[PDB]
């Protein structure tokens, strides 16, 4: 019945049609199938998907970038990503992601200053979350400290 | 083809070869037309007798 | 509208309550971008009322998804309207058919 | 951002939107502006970057040039879920990914998103260039088979172009090999022509 | 190989009259005690393999194997026994925030270890 | 070249008001396709026309509202005005007014007619009214351009001149919007077998087919003239004021003159330790000079890369 | 900003002695006493302070109202009129305007 | 941009010592006091150092010799 | 995760004997890819007496496997990771290449995380869960130390529970095992 | 604005050899890259003036299934080598050429008789393979004037490679001037058989097309 209906409007019953290229004007062999499909636009737009960040506001505890676009938040490196970096052998990139881009408070400012001055050097220091963990463990009756 | 290129020549020729293969394949696939339709898939006439 | 459908779009659009269907209507007096008034004929009329049905359309209101909800009239002045006939088209509706 | 296909790209390259850039590289923009004497003070540099001037765009194009940036698909199961590319500024809002590396990333170009991370120290940049670069991940570290292989819309093209059919246009032609393109493009023979004798070196 | 560790012993061998000693440590002790001073006192060992979740928690550093599965039991055992970490693993160096002893940081780790021998 | 026998424009046909069919003289083999493709691409790409750019109506403020007595919304009104086809004489940037009252259809015919504006289809629809007391009155601005220009492109040009109620619409500027060609071997029966190409263009009435073809040919010739002759095988620091008005107390001017110090920048890009290598000026004098320089340049803070003459 | 170590210490002290309104609370000789260095001088502290006066909030860290409006008047370009008049009033006629 | 690193890898040997050597050379070029032994082509210090290593002019021995000579010349 | 290449050589001859997996119908994996990226021990010996094919510590890059197949050797003793006697980590002379590189593995590389990441990546698995002997080609019996006992008919009885057959066509290469119980009767 | 179009000024060309050249253009208008490039490619691939050899009368049997009798190389390969010969004759419609050569074996283009207008771009080209003895051979070749190319199946004996080009291709890349990056960048890489510089061939094709379309503007741009 579809083939019959195509014959009433004077169209090729096969459904295919010869097409030409718009840039060269050379006919495509193997005639192409054209038609009318009902296309609909979904609620996943790229305007709401893009997000970028260089330096914003951190949290009072653990001093890390906030999160998932919650007031210009940062993105989450994870256990699988650090496994990937270790498999690559990316010690310096791993240390950088661990300290400079994160809760190393005295190192974030130094790295920003060196970048603006054109130095590209890192002062790793020590993350703030480890200090928070040490304080939380000492809040229980468990002595813990770092030796020399 | 890619594996032999890598094994014989090296890394730079095989990277260039991969890029050029992608370019030429993309071009000629579009130049071929290569559509799909209802009549493209055919049903054997013996299907009814087998059933 | 879809050129290829299944016939259920009319029922979905009507039953979704997203349009403005005419109850006990006979004829249209005044059509506007945001108002429709229908002069109900005497057959479907009971004594004690003027005989005017008024529909106030919904124009550009936020949804739960921050989308737009807009109703647009379909009828014109002096167009006889029966009972159960649509008068406005909600979001993604074309003459009472689900058109998304 | 959402992933998009760029076929014009080469292996060591990606399409980074200009809107996303000039935000990841903002300290570098400030440094270059101060060095070139276009902004005597940090407040002036900030105002000039916020106004998005042509000098800012030129400086961004200059600073982003030899600076690898690494992309990461959200479920990263093996090593090749993170690779480093050379950013190419595109006018748009979606990251353009390479079809050959799509297989390693397991991307499918239907709503998949991809994260971007910038290395800033010299050791990190040299590391992204010498260990994580997508032109260094040829073979798989699991078995050894190559991880880059044409898979779709390229296999079909090569298969179509290298095929034989009898009684095609220009069956008996004999030529030198550079002439096959001149013969297909203008007139005379089809790419499916048989019995064609060409001298190959 | 990672599964095949933590060898128990049946003979004393002057090492320790306990159970649950690592194969590498026991082999080092045997090679340093037998050939050097007293080759007569050999400590026979039995290689008893462990599952993944069990050999994961049987590590010398409490900083690792505490984040793995259970923190309360590991922390209580470490507090009671009074143990030290020394930061020998990738997880330990990651948590502390230093260069991992693998890849480009391996040379730095080797130099630090060599310098710590003298002081 | 051996007698190319190059083509001529002959037998221009006008099928309808918006549909034409032009023919060209028989031409050599392998030229019909290239000429036709180039002409079609240029005609679809860049052909100047006129389109509505901005519409102001006294009644409404924004485009997301309605108007009492009018059936369609302001969005429908703007989308109906977008397709309004109109050709304009010499000057561009014309503004025309439309005022009407009643209950009938409001078409493009009942628009104030000027001497330099011609409506080509006066049966268009501008969202007719329904109430007898309703009366629409708007001002339509028509310009001429070359390609599609969205509303966002023309936003930066208007910062202060953007009153409430002046609604802008997208511009198309393109009067062709469809064209096909076909090459056949005929009309050269006298000479050898050559090809003639026929162009089937479907405009909207704004442009003349012969004029459009001539414009496309001129554009192609101008573009090609750059291939005939193959050859060919500012930014500065803002602070460039002189060394004057720097409050040279006693010997700072003498030191600057003896050291051949430039106006400002070379003095700015100096460190204190290196400046002490200069002939002795005194700590107090150095601090005073540092204060004067700092009040404008943040304590001798700059490292310039290059120095223009 | 490119300060020396001593200039950085002086700037840190000065910015520590800054109120919410933007005017420094303690006076310059008090700042000099807080530094407590024989080498440090009033001219040096003035140089550092004037260097940090040009920061993003204009007229911040000003000793009083007299040298807060004057900074912005000097900042504004000479093209706008009545500038000389405004400078003359703000220089030494502050009580004359206040009453 | 430099497409691949293979000549430098073959010259150095370890595939991880190359990063350290090129980093400590690009540090000299960037922080200043040094001049590129190879003609720069509007390239960044990282690529300049990597290409100098590839050409066979810089390693973990020449750099130490030059640093020791400069220190002794003080 | 703790495993890292720290040594260059452990100086040990211990290792696992590697043979093609010959069970069921035919071989599922030959002695072609199970030994391609390994370093053999000194146990490699030519089929002829007092003849050798390759020295002790060699890396079978691309052609030593071809020579080994030409000589028709089934069992090769290859040093492995478990045999390595290094105190911490493993040595580099019992791991081969198996990377994006065509050379032996460098010291400092994280074998521990390179592995266990290629084992769990294929998460394409599933969930919710004595008389028939057919030979493929010409072969021999290869009883492999089966206790022969007197049988009623013209054959030999079997008393041992550990019986294994093998088919030999032209060289030491086998075709199938076909383990049989003690009730088997030798037909040929 | 209204009728202003961007004209290419960066026309840098870099050539690897005297027959290979890679041309490049500065950002054109949007979509003009394909237009200009395809027009030029088609015009200089299908219609270009030039001279070429067309047919050959070797002493022997006219059929292609001939014998060696000392040449050691098949006549099909002889004709294939002849096709790759770039002859250039000044203002002569058709001329005849011939050769006579001893039996050392290396047969080069210098063996053909030298005529006033017939010239050979390179005389080391191999027409005949190494002979086995002192036996000679007469070629009796001839050339004509033509444009483009026609096969020998229709227009007779070996072929007619009149067009003096070998390979033409173009690529179109993105470019920007100040803010808009939706501008194109034509890249042309052409190979010439010889006797014509690649830039000269491009210029000739451009002039051909310009004089081809100038008749349609009807004498536009008077002043």
Swiss-Prot record, chain A:
* Biotechnological applications: Co-administration of salinamide and rifampicin or salinamide and myxopyronin suppresses the emergence of resistance to both antibiotics.
Modifications the protein undergoes after translation, according to the UniProt entry: Acetylated on several lysine residues in the presence of glucose.
Q: Which residues carry this modification: N6-acetyllysine?
A: 7
Q: Which parts of the chain span the membrane according to its record? A: none
* Complex formation: The RNAP catalytic core consists of 2 alpha, 1 beta, 1 beta' and 1 omega subunit. When a sigma factor is associated with the core the holoenzyme is formed, which can initiate transcription. The rRNA transcription and antitermination complex (rrnTAC) consists of RNAP, NusA, NusB, NusE (rpsJ), NusG, SubB, ribosomal protein S4, DNA and precursor rRNA; S4 is more flexible than other subunits. In pull-down experiments interacts with CedA.
Q: What does this protein do?
A: DNA-dependent RNA polymerase (RNAP) catalyzes the transcription of DNA into RNA using the four ribonucleoside triphosphates as substrates.
Family of this protein: Belongs to the RNA polymerase beta chain family.
Q: What is this protein called?
A: DNA-directed RNA polymerase subunit beta
The species this protein was found in: Escherichia coli (strain K12)
Identify the gene encoding this protein. rpoB
UniProtKB/Swiss-Prot annotation, chain D:
Give a short account of its post-translational modification. Acetylated on several lysine residues in the presence of glucose.
Q: Applications in industry or biotech?
A: Co-administration of salinamide and rifampicin or salinamide and myxopyronin suppresses the emergence of resistance to both antibiotics.
Q: What does UniProt give as the signal peptide span?
A: none
This chain belongs to which protein, by name? Answer: DNA-directed RNA polymerase subunit beta'
User: What is the similarity comment for this entry?
Assistant: Belongs to the RNA polymerase beta' chain family.
Q: What's the domain of life for this entry?
A: Bacteria
Taken from the UniProt record, the cysteine pairs bridged by disulfide bonds within this chain are none
Query: What interactions and quaternary structure are annotated?
Result: The RNAP catalytic core consists of 2 alpha, 1 beta, 1 beta' and 1 omega subunit. When a sigma factor is associated with the core the holoenzyme is formed, which can initiate transcription. The rRNA transcription and antitermination complex (rrnTAC) consists of RNAP, NusA, NusB, NusE (rpsJ), NusG, SubB, ribosomal protein S4, DNA and precursor rRNA; S4 is more flexible than other subunits.
- Annotated positions binding Mg(2+): 108, 110, 112
Task: Identify the taxonomic lineage of the organism of origin.
Answer: Bacteria, Pseudomonadati, Pseudomonadota, Gammaproteobacteria, Enterobacterales
Q: Which organism is it from?
A: Escherichia coli (strain K12)
Curated annotation (Swiss-Prot), chain H:
EC assignment: the record states 2.7.7.6
Q: Which reaction does it catalyse?
A: RNA(n) + a ribonucleoside 5'-triphosphate = RNA(n+1) + diphosphate
Q: Which residues form a coiled coil?
A: none
Write the record's keywords in alphabetical order, separated by commas. DNA-directed RNA polymerase, Nucleotidyltransferase, Transcription, Transferase
Protein name (Swiss-Prot/TrEMBL):
DNA-directed RNA polymerase subunit omega
Q: Which residues of the full protein are shown?
A: 2 to 75 of 91
Subunit structure, briefly? Answer: The RNAP catalytic core consists of 2 alpha, 1 beta, 1 beta' and 1 omega subunit. When a sigma factor is associated with the core the holoenzyme is formed, which can initiate transcription. The rRNA transcription and antitermination complex (rrnTAC) consists of RNAP, NusA, NusB, NusE (rpsJ), NusG, SubB, ribosomal protein S4, DNA and precursor rRNA; S4 is more flexible than other subunits.
**Source organism (scientific name):** Escherichia coli (strain K12)
Q: Which family does it belong to?
A: Belongs to the RNA polymerase subunit omega family.
| GO terms under cellular component | cytosol; cytosolic DNA-directed RNA polymerase complex; RNA polymerase complex; transcription elongation factor complex
Q: Which GO terms describe its biological process?
A: bacterial-type flagellum assembly; bacterial-type flagellum-dependent cell motility; cell motility; cellular response to cell envelope stress; DNA-templated transcription initiation; intracellular iron ion homeostasis; nitrate assimilation; protein-containing complex assembly
Single GO MF annotation: bacterial-type RNA polymerase core enzyme binding
Taxonomy, superkingdom: Bacteria
Q: Does the keyword Coiled coil apply?
A: no
Swiss-Prot record, chain J:
Q: Which reaction does it catalyse?
A: RNA(n) + a ribonucleoside 5'-triphosphate = RNA(n+1) + diphosphate
The keyword Nucleotidyltransferase appears for this protein: yes
Q: Which keywords accompany this UniProt record?
A: Acetylation, ADP-ribosylation, DNA-directed RNA polymerase, Nucleotidyltransferase, Transcription, Transferase
**Record keywords: DNA repair included?**
no
Known EC number: 2.7.7.6
Question: Anything noted about its domains?
Answer: The N-terminal domain is essential for RNAP assembly and basal transcription, whereas the C-terminal domain is involved in interaction with transcriptional regulators (such as CRP) and with upstream promoter elements.
Per the record, the similarity remark reads: Belongs to the RNA polymerase alpha chain family.
Task: Relate the assembly described in the record.
Answer: Homodimer. The RNAP catalytic core consists of 2 alpha, 1 beta, 1 beta' and 1 omega subunit. When a sigma factor is associated with the core the holoenzyme is formed, which can initiate transcription. Both the N- and C-terminus interact with different regions of transcriptional regulator CRP. The rRNA transcription and antitermination complex (rrnTAC) consists of RNAP, NusA, NusB, NusE (rpsJ), NusG, SubB, ribosomal protein S4, DNA and precursor rRNA; S4 is more flexible than other subunits.
This chain belongs to the protein called: DNA-directed RNA polymerase subunit alpha
- Give the originating organism: Escherichia coli (strain K12)
Range within the parent protein = 4 to 238 of 329
């Amino acid at each position: 019945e579809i083939k019959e209906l195509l014959k009433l409007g004077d169209l090729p019953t096969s459904g295919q049609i010869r097409l030409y290229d718009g840039r060269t004007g050379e006919q495509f062999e193997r005639p192409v199938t054209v038609g009318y499909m009902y296309m609909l636009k979904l609620n996943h737009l790229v305007d709401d998907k893009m997000h970028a960040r260089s330096t914003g506001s951190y949290s009072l505890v653990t001093q890390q970038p906030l999160g998932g676009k919650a007031q210009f938040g940062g993105q989450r490196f994870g256990e699988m990503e650090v496994w990937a970096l270790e498999a690559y052998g990316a010690a310096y990139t791993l240390q950088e992601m661990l300290t400079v881009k994160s809760d190393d408070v005295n190192g974030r400012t130094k790295m920003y200053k060196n970048i603006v001055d054109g130095n590209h050097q890192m002062e790793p220091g020590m993350p703030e979350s480890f200090n928070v963990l040490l304080k939380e463990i000492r809040s229980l009756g468990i002595n813990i400290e770092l030796e020399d | 083809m890619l594996n032999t290129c890598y094994r014989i020549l090296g890394l730079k020729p095989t990277v260039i070869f991969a890029d050029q293969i992608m370019y030429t394949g993309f071009a000629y696939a579009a130049r071929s037309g290569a559509s799909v339709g209802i009549d493209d898939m055919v049903i054997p006439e013996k299907k009814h007798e087998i059933i | 509208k879809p050129l290829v459908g299944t016939g259920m779009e009319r029922a979905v659009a009507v039953d979704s309550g997203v349009t403005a269907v005419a109850k006990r209507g006979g004829v249209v007096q005044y059509v506007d971008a945001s108002r429709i008034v229908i002069k109900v004929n005497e057959d479907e009329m009971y004594p004690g009322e003027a005989g005017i049905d008024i529909y106030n359309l919904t124009k550009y209101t936020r949804s739960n998804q921050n989308t737009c909800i807009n109703q647009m009239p379909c009828v014109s002045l002096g167009e006889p309207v029966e009972r159960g006939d649509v008068l406005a088209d909600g979001p993604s509706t074309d003459l009472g058919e689900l058109a998304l | 951002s959402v992933i998009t296909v760029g076929p014009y790209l080469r292996l060591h390259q990606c399409g980074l939107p200009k809107k996303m850039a000039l935000e990841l590289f903002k300290p570098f923009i400030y440094g270059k502006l101060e060095l070139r004497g276009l902004a005597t003070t940090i407040k002036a540099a900030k105002k000039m970057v916020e106004r998005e001037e042509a000098v800012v765009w030129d400086i961004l194009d200059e600073v982003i040039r030899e600076h690898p940036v690494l992309l990461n698909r959200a479920p990263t199961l093996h090593r090749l879920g993170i690779q480093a590319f050379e950013p190419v500024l595109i006018e748009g809002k979606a990251i353009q990914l390479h079809p050959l590396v799509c297989a390693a990333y397991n991307a499918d170009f239907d709503g998949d998103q991809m994260a971007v991370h910038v290395p800033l120290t010299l050791e990190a940049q040299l590391e992204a260039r010498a260990l994580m670069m997508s032109t260094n991940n040829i073979l798989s570290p699991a078995n050894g088979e190559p991880i880059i292989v044409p898979s779709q819309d390229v296999v079909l093209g090569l298969y179509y172009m290298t095929r034989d059919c009898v009684n095609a246009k220009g069956e008996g032609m004999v030529l030198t090999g550079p002439k096959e393109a001149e013969r297909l493009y203008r007139s005379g023979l089809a790419s499916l022509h048989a019995r064609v004798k060409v001298r190959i070196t | 190989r990672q599964m095949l560790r933590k060898a128990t012993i049946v003979n004393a061998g002057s090492s320790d009259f306990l159970e649950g000693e690592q194969v590498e440590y026991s082999r080092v002790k045997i090679a340093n005690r037998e050939l050097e001073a007293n080759g007569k006192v050999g400590a026979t060992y039995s290689r008893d393999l462990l599952g993944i979740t069990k050999a994961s928690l049987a590590t010398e550093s409490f900083i690792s194997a505490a984040s793995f599965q259970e923190t309360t039991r590991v922390l209580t055992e470490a507090a009671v026994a009074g143990k030290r970490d020394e930061l020998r693993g990738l997880k330990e160096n990651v948590i502390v925030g230093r260069l991992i002893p693998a890849g480009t940081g391996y040379a730095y780790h080797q130099d630090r270890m060599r310098r710590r021998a003298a002081g | 070249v051996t007698e190319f026998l190059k083509p001529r424009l002959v037998d221009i046909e006008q099928v309808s008001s918006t549909h034409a069919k032009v023919t060209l003289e028989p031409l050599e083999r392998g030229f019909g396709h290239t000429l036709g493709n180039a002409l079609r691409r240029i005609l679809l790409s860049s052909m100047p026309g006129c389109a509505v750019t901005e519409v102001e109506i006294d009644g409404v403020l924004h485009e997301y509202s309605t108007k009492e007595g009018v059936q369609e919304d302001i969005l429908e009104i703007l989308l109906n005005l977008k397709g309004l086809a109109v050709r304009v004489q010499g000057k561009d940037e014309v503004i025309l007014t439309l005022n009407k009252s009643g209950i009938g259809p409001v078409t493009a015919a009942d628009i104030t007619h000027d001497g330099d504006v011609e409506i080509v289809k006066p049966q268009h629809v501008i969202c007719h009214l329904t109430d007898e007391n309703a009366s629409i009155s708007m001002r339509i601005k028509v310009q001429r351009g070359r390609g599609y220009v969205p509303a966002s492109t023309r936003i930066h040009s208007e910062e202060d001149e953007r009153p409430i109620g002046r609604l802008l619409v997208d511009a198309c500027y393109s009067p062709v919007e469809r064209i096909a060609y076909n090459v056949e071997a005929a009309r050269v029966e006298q000479r050898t077998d050559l090809d003639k190409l026929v162009i089937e263009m479907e405009t909207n009435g704004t442009i003349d087919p012969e004029e459009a073809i001539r414009r496309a040919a001129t554009i192609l010739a101008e573009q090609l003239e750059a291939f005939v002759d193959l050859r060919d095988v500012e930014f500065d620091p803002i602070l460039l004021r002189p060394v004057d008005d720097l409050e040279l107390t006693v010997r700072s001017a003498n030191c600057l003159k003896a050291e051949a110090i430039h106006y400002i920048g070379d003095l700015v890009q100096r460190t204190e330790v290196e400046l002490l290598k200069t002939p002795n000026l005194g700590k107090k004098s150095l601090t005073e000079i540092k204060d004067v320089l700092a009040s404008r340049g943040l304590s001798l803070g700059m490292r310039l890369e290059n120095w223009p003459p | 900003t490119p300060f020396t170590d001593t200039d950085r210490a002086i700037a840190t002290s000065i910015v520590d002695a800054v109120d919410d309104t933007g005017y420094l609370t303690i006076q310059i000789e008090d700042i000099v006493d807080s530094i407590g260095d024989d080498e440090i001088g009033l001219e040096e502290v003035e140089a550092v302070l004037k260097r940090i006066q040009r920061f993003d909030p204009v007229g911040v860290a000003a000793k009083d109202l007299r040298d807060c409006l004057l900074i912005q008047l000097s900042q504004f370009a000479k093209e706008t009129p009545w500038l000389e008049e405004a400078r003359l009033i703000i220089s030494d006629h502050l009580d004359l305007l206040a009453n | 941009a430099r497409v691949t690193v293979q000549d430098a890898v073959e010259k150095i040997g370890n595939r991880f010592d190359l990063v350290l050597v090129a980093a400590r050379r690009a540090r000299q070029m960037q922080v200043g006091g040094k001049d590129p032994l190879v003609p720069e082509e509007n390239d960044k210090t990282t690529v300049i150092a990597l290409r100098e290593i590839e050409e066979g002019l810089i390693n973990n021995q020449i750099l130490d010799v030059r640093e020791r000579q400069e220190q002794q010349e003080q | 995760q703790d495993l890292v290449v720290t040594e260059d050589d452990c100086g040990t001859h211990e290792g696992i004997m590697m043979t093609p997996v010959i069970e069921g119908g035919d071989v599922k994996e030959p002695l072609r890819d199970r030994v391609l990226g390994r370093v053999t021990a000194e146990d490699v010996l030519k089929p002829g007496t007092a003849d050798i094919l390759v020295p002790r510590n060699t890396l079978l890059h691309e052609q030593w496997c071809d020579l080994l197949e030409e000589n028709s050797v089934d069992a090769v003793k290859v040093r492995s990771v478990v045999s390595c006697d290094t105190d911490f980590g493993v040595c580099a002379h019992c791991y081969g290449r198996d990377l994006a590189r065509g050379h032996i593995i460098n010291k400092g590389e994280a074998i521990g995380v390179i592995a266990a990441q290629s084992i769990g990546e294929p998460g394409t698995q599933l969930t919710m869960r004595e008389s028939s002997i057919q030979v493929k080609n010409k072969g021999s019996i290869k009883l492999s130390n089966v206790k022969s006992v007197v049988n009623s008919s013209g054959k030999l009885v079997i008393t041992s529970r550990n019986t294994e057959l093998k088919l030999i066509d032209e060289f030491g290469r086998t075709k199938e095992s076909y383990k049989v119980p003690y009730g088997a009767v030798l037909a040929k």
